[model samples]
Target: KAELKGQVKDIVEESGVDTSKLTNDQINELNKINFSKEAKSGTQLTYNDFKKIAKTLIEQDARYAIPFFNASKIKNMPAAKTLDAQSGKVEDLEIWNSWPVQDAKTGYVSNWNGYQLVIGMMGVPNVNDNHIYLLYNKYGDNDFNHWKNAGPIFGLGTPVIQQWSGSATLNKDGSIQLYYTKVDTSDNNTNHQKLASATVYLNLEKDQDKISIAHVDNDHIVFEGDGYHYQTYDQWKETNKGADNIAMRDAHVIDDDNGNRYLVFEASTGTENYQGDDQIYQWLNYGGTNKDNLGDFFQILSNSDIKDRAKWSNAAIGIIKLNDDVKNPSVAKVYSPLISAPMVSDEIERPDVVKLGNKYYLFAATRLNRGSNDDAWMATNKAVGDNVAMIGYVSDNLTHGYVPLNESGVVLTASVPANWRTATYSYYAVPVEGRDDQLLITSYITNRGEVAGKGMHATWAPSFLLQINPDNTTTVLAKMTNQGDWIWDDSSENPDMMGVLEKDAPNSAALPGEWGKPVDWDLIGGYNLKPHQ
Candidate 1:
């Protein structure tokens, strides 16, 4: 009796609950239930307070097989399936990287026990040796035996290959194509730097091998240009004026309101040697298809001083076209309306675009801007503030206007452990049917303190199924469906870096904390917590 009473007293005091009013039987009944009460906090959190925070994290924490990291694999999220049309779930996330692995012995292991999803897969096997693999998860981040069922989606030794920096598009007919770069067969390093090629990977079923199609460029659909242009040192001049062209990494194509197709890419102003790559160009009427030369394509708009600092690196394009045959496309910088002082002094790059109900959303990765001084991310590099990663927003009109989705703004920040303290964590955004908002998933790269089977040590953190609510506030509803681990020695070249297969697919693991460490949910960027039902 004394023991039970004392236990009740401790819990009551810790929870600040008045237990004196409870009868002995009531106390005993309550003791049988594992009840938890949140501890209080002040400017500085107390251990108890931290425990409360930890509890919240556990409640919100989700379990998945594979985590999203590389840029090749597509995300298959389940939380999005639970929401209604007006209540969409996660919007999108970014693509991060890892070390590469050349053998099966270098595979990843985990702690969980069920099905896993492979969200990332990309790499170059060499000039002509590039390969593709699918990562799968059968368990959560806690167990590796769960990964026993994981393997390549396509059987080994398929035909298609690419160099680097490719894009994957799923056709309406349930087929997928991996449009990739061709390695420069030349000895000149710059020759194949960003040069590209195309290959189609098709798989009718979810779990199957990808059949390769021959490499073809005639299908190389261009928006406002074709390939290859040369220039002198710094004299800005268009070489293929009548020839038309595409920038190294800046290009896009989408339909406007009136069924008119538009092609967008950056034009080099200072031609000396690819310098002054600023001008954003658009080719309005290319006859729906590239049958006609885009040279006559209209130039829609451009950023005044962006390329002056540094040509836009890689940005995704989103169109706000109300009609199927877009007669008009909204014009405006979709994000980054207010430029705060540089925290890390790095510029952002690689944007992912999506269209929601009536708004268009964009998510991009941020690196330390090399110019001026350190921005917010710079402070994080010094352990001063949270780490700055991806930023986001929407647009009403293009050209002269755009409004940052005040709610979705700063969609990703440095505080997220999944990405905190790491070189860089990136996220991408997409809008799918099942939900109201959009679905977001992040690929986090972190170090490992323990080594597991398959020479794998670090883990590819779990992917988040983020929900961008109507209010613009984002919340992580569930973990992605798959997970894996990275195998490599971080003690040297890249201590915590993950191993990759074929220089493309990154190994897997959970992000932020060690396998069993508590995830810090309170620190999530712009997250609004709610009842965890």
Candidate 2:
């Protein structure tokens, strides 16, 4: 309090600007300055405010400071994006947001018959719609990491428009199941998205150095969202009559010791939560009139509008009970949510859960603008940045009761200058073998380039090593010095991930620097809709 008072007096004495002469808007702007923004409700100051203030103070006064940017970080930006996700959905061979097949039983990366399997969503050069592409190391080429690019898993059935990110499971029956968001662009207004899964049968390739799919099961919807608990696109359109972006995707399944399976995905709260449902994460205890642990921006909103923004900001780590069957699974029940960050964040994507010794670590990707975009909260409080982050929480149970990791919920965010290229995102954690306290993070660098032909930042960002402390907080153990570096060093390869480099990156540049030039790929191996005859 006195800092501002002293600053006001100093302004009057040194700059000849009288504090009394300041307008109400100026005073309000001054009042908007507070202590917390990154996480937890505090005196108006958001993360941006705190960071900016700290930097300015160090620059102006006596405290010491260290440079935040690393030279390698600047160097990591490719001369041209050899592979970018935001180009034409077809023709350009886009393969972004990929994941290795995991063992449905353990929820960990898995390999079969001495071969590791990974799937990447290949779509238009720049569009969000995508289809799965299966990739593997050339048979017997596991150690040195040679690879092959098998075409679209669903063949022609791969939708041209929408089939976004999801997880893959290697069933014990030797079948592989892929779960994803199936979109319906029929109502341009609603642009609905539904959760769906299909199984791909891989016949051990008789190929000298290859594996191929024999057939894939019919892709079918697992569950239709309910308006009360899980908001479907229709319900979302009804409640948020103005917005159209869909959120019901990213189907990750985990199994428990009790022989039960759960599907953890992303979705918005239904009207029930919007219209004062008590199924809240926090049971009425925050300051301000609203009980949500959030900024007082709700104070200016009408009660209905307040609830609207709260629900709008309520992007959550949604969970649903699944049948015990791993190869062919269906949704049994949809629970409320593990956590709904109301008035704190608008979207939470790519939810991941890792079971450690008596603890379940929950992590997800989120952006800097936690407040609802259409609202004035962010602008009013200056809570803005391009910092995409991997935020997390910890709990004992799998379905609920998670507390934010590091108190702020932020495990890591981009710490470079604004002009830097990597606004990295989609951090998925892989548990280390013996280090229960450490997790290996894998994510991609984004936003550095233009379209597929223009070199976009769509490849893997150097992985990170996270140290989870006993206090539920975390520390960055270290990060790779180069972009595109894998979590496991090539020579010290991960036993489960057989190879690093593919026979070729379908989008790899022709010449050493001929990036953005397409090395086209075709939907060669499997059928899209029906099982291969």
Query: What TM-score does prediction 2 earn?
Result: 0.68
Model 2 residue 249 distance off true place after TM-score fit, in angstroms:
1.0
Q: Which candidate's TM-score is highest?
A: 2
After best superposition, candidate 1 residue 279: deviation in angstroms?
14
Alpha-carbon error at 521 in model 2, in Å? 36
Q: Write the per-residue lDDT of candidate 2 for residues 1-533, one digit (tens) a residue.
A: 11234233442345444556766555544343332323222111122222333232222211111112122232222212222233322244534576777765445567577776767665544444456677665222323224455557766542334676788877668788888777766676344778888898887764576677788896788866776666776666665646323578887777777878787888765654442222122323132222222233323233555455444455656889978666667778877777665444557788888887778888887654454333333221222123355667888788777776654465665432222233355778876555677776766554423322254435545555667888887766533323333234333323222111111343211112221222113221111111111
- Clash count for each candidate, listed in order shown: 96, 22
Question: Model 1, stretches more than 4 Å misplaced?
Answer: 1-162, 172-175, 181-188, 191-247, 250-347, 369-371, 384-388, 397-400, 407-409, 416-424, 447-460, 469-533
User: Model 2, which residues run further than 4 Å from truth?
Assistant: 1-92, 127-129, 138-145, 157-161, 275-311, 373-385, 417-420, 448-453, 479-533
Clashes of 2: 22
CA lDDT, every model vs. true structure? 0.30, 0.53
Worst 10 residues of 2 by lDDT: 524-533
Q: Which 10 successive residues of model 1 have the least lDDT summed?
A: 38-47
